[PDB]
Design a protein around this ligand. Sequence first.
Ligand SMILES: [Zn+2]
Ligand SMILES: [Zn+2]
Ligand SMILES: [Zn+2]
Ligand SMILES: [Zn+2]
Lengths: 627, 627
Amino acid sequence: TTAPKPPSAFTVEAQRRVEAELPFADRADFERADRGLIRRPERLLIRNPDGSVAWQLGGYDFLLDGKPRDSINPSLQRQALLNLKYGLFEVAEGIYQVRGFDLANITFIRGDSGWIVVDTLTTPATARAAYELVSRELGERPIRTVIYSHAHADHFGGVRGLVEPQQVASGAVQIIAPAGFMEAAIVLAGNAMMRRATYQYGTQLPKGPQGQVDMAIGKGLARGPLSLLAPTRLIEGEGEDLVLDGVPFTFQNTPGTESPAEMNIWLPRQKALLMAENVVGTLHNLYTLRGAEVRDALGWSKYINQALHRFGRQAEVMFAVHNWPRWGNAEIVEVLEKQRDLYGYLHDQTLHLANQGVTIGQVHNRLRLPPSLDQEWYDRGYHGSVSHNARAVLNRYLGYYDGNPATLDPLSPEDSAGRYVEYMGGAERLLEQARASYARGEYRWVVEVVNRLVFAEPDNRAARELQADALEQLGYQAENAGWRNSYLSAAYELRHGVPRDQGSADALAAMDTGLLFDYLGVRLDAGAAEGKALSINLRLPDIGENYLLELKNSHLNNLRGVQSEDAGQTVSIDRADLNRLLLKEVSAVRLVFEGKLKSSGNPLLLGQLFGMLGDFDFWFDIVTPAA
Amino acid sequence: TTAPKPPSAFTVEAQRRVEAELPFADRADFERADRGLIRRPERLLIRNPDGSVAWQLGGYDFLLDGKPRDSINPSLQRQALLNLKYGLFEVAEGIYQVRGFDLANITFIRGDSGWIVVDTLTTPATARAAYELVSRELGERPIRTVIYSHAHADHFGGVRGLVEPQQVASGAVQIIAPAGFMEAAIVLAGNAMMRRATYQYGTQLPKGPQGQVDMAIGKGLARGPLSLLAPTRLIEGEGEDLVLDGVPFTFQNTPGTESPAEMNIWLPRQKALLMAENVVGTLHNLYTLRGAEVRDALGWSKYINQALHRFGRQAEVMFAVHNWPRWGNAEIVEVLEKQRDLYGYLHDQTLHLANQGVTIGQVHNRLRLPPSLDQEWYDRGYHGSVSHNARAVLNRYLGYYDGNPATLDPLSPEDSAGRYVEYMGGAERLLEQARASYARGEYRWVVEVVNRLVFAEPDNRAARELQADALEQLGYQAENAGWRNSYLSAAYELRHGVPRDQGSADALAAMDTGLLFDYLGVRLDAGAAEGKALSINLRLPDIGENYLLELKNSHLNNLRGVQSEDAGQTVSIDRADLNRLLLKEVSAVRLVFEGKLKSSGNPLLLGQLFGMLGDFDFWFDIVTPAA
Ligand SMILES: [Zn+2]
Ligand SMILES: [Zn+2]
Ligand SMILES: [Zn+2]
Ligand SMILES: [Zn+2]
């Protein structure tokens, strides 16, 4: 059988262990997530221009009844309910939030003549909707400044929902971001990341006690087009002290990079500290399970300390681009201290264990936070985990190899799986020992060993089913939402198979030209390219940039600011029309005829180059070897 | 039995496959490594001031006979012999090298009045010795400029062998390095890296056909004190065009970082291109098996291209800080192109496979260089490998997790080993199936499966022995020197056990104060620290720096440029005397009495803090669970 099973007796007992271990009697978050509430609309349903649904909370109803569900980790269930505390809130005099309209919060500060808005949610429809709500409850006011607190999609994504390019062009609206917003806003492993994110986000799970229940830092991500408007003022260096529509701001940039992607925001009139996504109601990821390059817990920790000493030591309220605010100085001082020490202790004690020989394969089973960090709800691994962050720190410093040459040159799991199964007595004997292991609760073992069988025999229904039951129990047990969603997506794929059926113009525009040709380079099919040599001068006059493109040895190179007399073709074309070409909104032919793609030399090269570009299927296999 | 065994029939056949696959008929490297030779001393033996031996080539004699040794990969044996081509060489008019006096080369350029020297080998004795040799053959000339081509120990390490601080202080000698030399010259996972490097360097193997035979980019590393003198001029930005002792230089920095750690060197009078350790007679590491953060193959590839277009297209000779030069423009153009396309194709095709779902656990078994890159000796994985570099690229972009939740929360190998062994019929039945696997040549399997048994039963002599035989055959087969040394060190540890018996003042001086207290932070024992809270203002007046040290929640913080009125102790002390304190050259007591460690507030804190600092045992276990 293949539907979700009930929590086992062991999982029930794991959930019990969690309530013994954690301070459920500390209920103050509930008193915080409700404070200053001005309006919670009855039912929230947000629609896109094309009529798809962007966001909706009704599927989380099962949680409103309050009652325990042993197929959800109880700590995760606590975070799940809190995240349901959506609507328009006051944070302090002239400071409002709409929370729970998307993954992130949006922040409206009262200027003398209009709004200063921090962040824009994920997609225009949810922004427009946050704004509609502000305007019914507080009075319609124009937006004079949008501020992007950092270079992520769930912060700049719904900007077109709030303002139009004409408003930016006239100077009616300024967009403010940290220097290096545009370098970081934008890929080269994008298909892999995205596929893997279907697990972390649980894009195929039902909302329900046996599927998606939360995303730690929000309920989930909104579904809609992606928008982006270039900022007009950058905050440089360490930061800058500005005044906007009469209101004083201090921006504190991620230190001491030339290219900050993020900044804290201090408002001295309200003594209000807006922490950027460096402090949230959860340990954050140093490594997102969907894959990216490991973050810097050491720098993270030092940046929080810098905030603590600059603003923390006078703050009356601290609030965030995810989750809910905290009020009062002592409370703010302690949280800052703890968030600081949590990233620091993750970092320093991983490396303490690593220096004593503990490996990337062992550290998550050795490292434990000390009580003062372990016992705060905003320290729980809902989003990042101690387990995968400790591995990530170690991986940043020593890489993926554990130093035992038994693992230096390892066979692919699907080429060793047959032999593991043979050495184990065959499929049936392996299944039989595994059932006994399951019946003892040994899920972290069972998923390891039966996975050897799924890779050996991917069409073995009984292996798949058992593997799924075990992964599912792990997911009911997970504190971590990405972990839970992963566990249940894998079970879902193993029981059913993967979908046999199945780009933002703003994001392509934001992409640097070098990076674009770097991506085209990743698309290059090496088979088709073997033995080919071509080179082409590319001139993009709308943006005043020249590249040299050289295909040799099955590698596509691109070199900014260079031209060669030896090129086989010289192609001139605005970046703007190159973007339309790449997005299939226009054809090469159409663009020559219009006199917008001029050429000289061999007119065929560019096309030959484009024709060697392969594409990727999205729904690759994860839990089985490739089909 | 426990001594090295003979190559198996399979290993013999693997070595044969290598000679069928590779262009041994391309012998030109031999004609290159000998060109311009002025002197090769008869026997090379270099001694340290304390009388230890720093360097010596006599142990490599077995290779001089030329004849095949099937316990060495034949391609590796080729690189091994070439690296034995040591001594004083002319590269071009007024350009000399001493090669094979240490891991790296040292370069002497003829100035009007003296030498300009590029790089200083690993330790003073080998520098002094390189210089002695130059001075006998070419005339003794003073050194006016030392240049560090990049921020590694085997480039700045033997500087005190060439010049003294008084010479730098008077202005008699300038030291030139890329901006950001001092940020990169210097740790936090140093014990782990070092222990692991005993495998990669083979520090316990005999020199011999069944032990160490080479280190790819040199014969090996010299044993001696580590020296470092701060540069006096930095090359900023993209680079700078200088003239030194009459001779024109162009420095090209690693682009477009503010903090270059490396630079190419072009000499227009000789049309001579000195490539920094970005181009060598080998694919280099993006990831060194001893562990560090993954390098940037994309940037690497673009930097070589920039060199190609700036200097490559007029170069007559290209030479290097490792291995031997290449002469003539066409040859130089092609190599540059290929080295460029090799890092590019590693990078772009890893990510092509990753976008199609291939994982970090599979990519090394899928990626193959195309013939035009595969068939050049300077493209062989002697140092880096295609196998571990492809994994490293993927790890940079997606991290260590393969996306299958069967591997998200894995049991430590020593906690799953019992069960793998139980499911496999017990120790004896597992050994018996493994012997049959061995007898078929299936070494990459055997080391995987028998390792499960060594972790289950580390005192099981037969498991250990079999595991060692298999790892040893893998090592005889390895093209890659770090891989070979690892394989044979693991065999060595499994047969014998690990050593039951068992800091540079210049390097500590070079360490930034923040980074030093970051390291003390890693030394902190979390047990001893639990529940403790102390804070201390540190003032270092020789260098004009103030730190705030705050111990809380079992984490030590340090904050540059800040003081607090609330500190429990204020300690003032020159960085210079703090260094002596840390190196046990002086005591705290001695330094108060001398009036060099002043205090106020609670005089005990600093000592209490130092007393919570643990230390690491060097010889931790790798191939067995901890003792
Ligand atoms: Zn973010
Ligand atoms: Zn966010
Ligand atoms: Zn180096
Ligand atoms: Zn080097």
